[PDB]
């Protein structure tokens, strides 16, 4: 996998976690 | 607390390379020529020579007029001349570096018993020494590695109690005479 798209996938997964792993929770 | 002493040290160093053909051949030649039991007896003399060389090399870095050099090199040379490895004309500190392990091997009691004609083999010499047939000037010595000093060279003989040195016959002769 191209490193650029791997980095983008990691960032999207982290954003999804951040939405799920809410600071309020 | 106890009244004991714990001072002790090893008398040999094992080689770094376990299987080196040239070293094996040289050590086996030494063992065969001097009738030694194993490799450790070669390593012991090698360690002794290494220590003497290290001391001599440490004394050769000082100034010639240094009192400690004059005091200690004189003692080292005197001891080497006493045991017979060195000669009186070669009592400089540089000649110590020219000594070889065979020089120390030639001064054992086992080789001197053979060289003096008391034994007809080096192995026979070891057997004779270990069986209490040899005395050094008054004392029965049964240690093959006994290093003979120069002044003691003339005084190696059969013991007075030995069947060879004028003593009573041994067990086998007495039993065979009792047979007939």
């Amino acid at each position: 996998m191209r490193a650029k798209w791997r980095k983008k996938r990691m960032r999207r997964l982290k954003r999804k976690r951040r939405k799920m792993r809410q600071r309020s929770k | 607390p106890v009244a004991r002493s714990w001072v002790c040290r090893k008398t040999y160093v094992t080689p770094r390379r376990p299987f080196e053909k040239s070293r094996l051949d040289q050590e086996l030649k030494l063992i065969g020529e001097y009738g030694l039991r194993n490799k450790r007896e070669v390593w012991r003399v090698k360690f002794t020579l290494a220590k003497i060389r290290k001391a001599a090399r440490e004394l050769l870095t000082l100034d010639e007029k240094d009192p400690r050099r004059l005091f200690e090199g004189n003692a080292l040379l005197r001891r080497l001349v006493r045991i017979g490895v060195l000669d009186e004309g070669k009592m400089k500190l540089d000649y110590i570096l020219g000594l070889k392990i065979e020089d120390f091997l030639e001064r054992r009691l086992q080789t001197q018993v053979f060289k003096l004609g008391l034994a007809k083999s080096i192995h026979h010499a070891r057997v004779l020494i270990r069986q209490r047939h040899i005395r050094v000037r008054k004392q029965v010595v049964n240690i093959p590695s006994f290093i003979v000093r120069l002044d003691s060279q003339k005084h190696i003989d059969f013991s007075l109690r030995s069947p060879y040195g004028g003593g009573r016959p041994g067990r086998v002769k007495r039993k065979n005479a009792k047979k007939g």
């Binding site: - | 060389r53 090399r57 050769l60 540089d94 570096l97 020219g98 000594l99």
Partner: protein
């Protein structure tokens, strides 16, 4: 029977040059192997250091050749190294022996401390390079022996060195580079200007110039 093809060979065969040091003085290249046989003769002993198979990729498949490394020396001040690649092992070994005795250099031997008796070690610290391999030779006291790897030790013994300390850096698993670096280090012993070589050089007749009349006849 030997029939020389060069002036130096004709001079050597006709007993006009006394020693190989006369040739070494004028840095004359040696192109005939029979000169070294004439001078060093029986004292030369050689040893094969490595047989290395190399392969060239072709359309039909790999083509294999064998390379022999041979070190030679007389144990009394001269040493040489040769490398030869051939289709057969025996041919490569013969070529390597010839090439090794062709490139034979003298070795300078010095003292570590007091200068008593015959020289026993290298005059000073000398370094040789080959590829990534660096080899350093340091003088050692009398009776020390050679403290080195098995590969440099053979060349140092053939050169006639009794005592020496050795350091090495780089990929020494490359046996050819390891041997060539220590051969270069040994060769650099006579090219080092020490204070006892500061005297002005007195020139002498070259063998080409001295025996020109004899060369004209033959």
């Amino acid at each position: 029977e030997w029939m020389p093809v060069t002036k130096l060979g004709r001079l050597v065969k006709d007993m006009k040059i006394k020693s190989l040091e006369e040739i070494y003085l004028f840095s004359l290249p040696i192109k005939e192997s029979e000169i070294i046989d004439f001078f060093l003769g029986a004292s030369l002993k050689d040893e094969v250091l490595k047989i290395m198979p190399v392969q060239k990729q072709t359309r039909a498949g790999q083509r294999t050749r064998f390379k022999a490394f041979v070190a030679i020396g007389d144990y009394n001040g001269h040493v040489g190294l040769g490398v030869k690649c051939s289709k057969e092992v025996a041919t490569a070994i013969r070529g390597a022996i010839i090439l090794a005795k062709l490139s034979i250099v003298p070795v300078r031997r010095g003292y570590w401390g007091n200068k008593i008796g015959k020289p026993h070690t290298v005059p000073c610290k000398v370094t040789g390079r080959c590829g990534s391999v660096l080899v350093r030779l340091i003088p050692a006291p009398r009776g020390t022996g050679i403290v080195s790897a098995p590969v440099p030790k053979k060349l140092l013994m053939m050169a006639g060195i009794d005592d020496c300390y050795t350091s090495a850096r780089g990929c020494t698993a490359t046996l050819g580079n390891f041997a060539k670096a220590t051969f270069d280090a040994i060769s650099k012993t006579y090219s080092y200007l020490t204070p006892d070589l500061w005297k002005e050089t007195v020139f002498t007749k070259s063998p080409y110039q001295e025996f020109t009349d004899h060369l004209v006849k033959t």
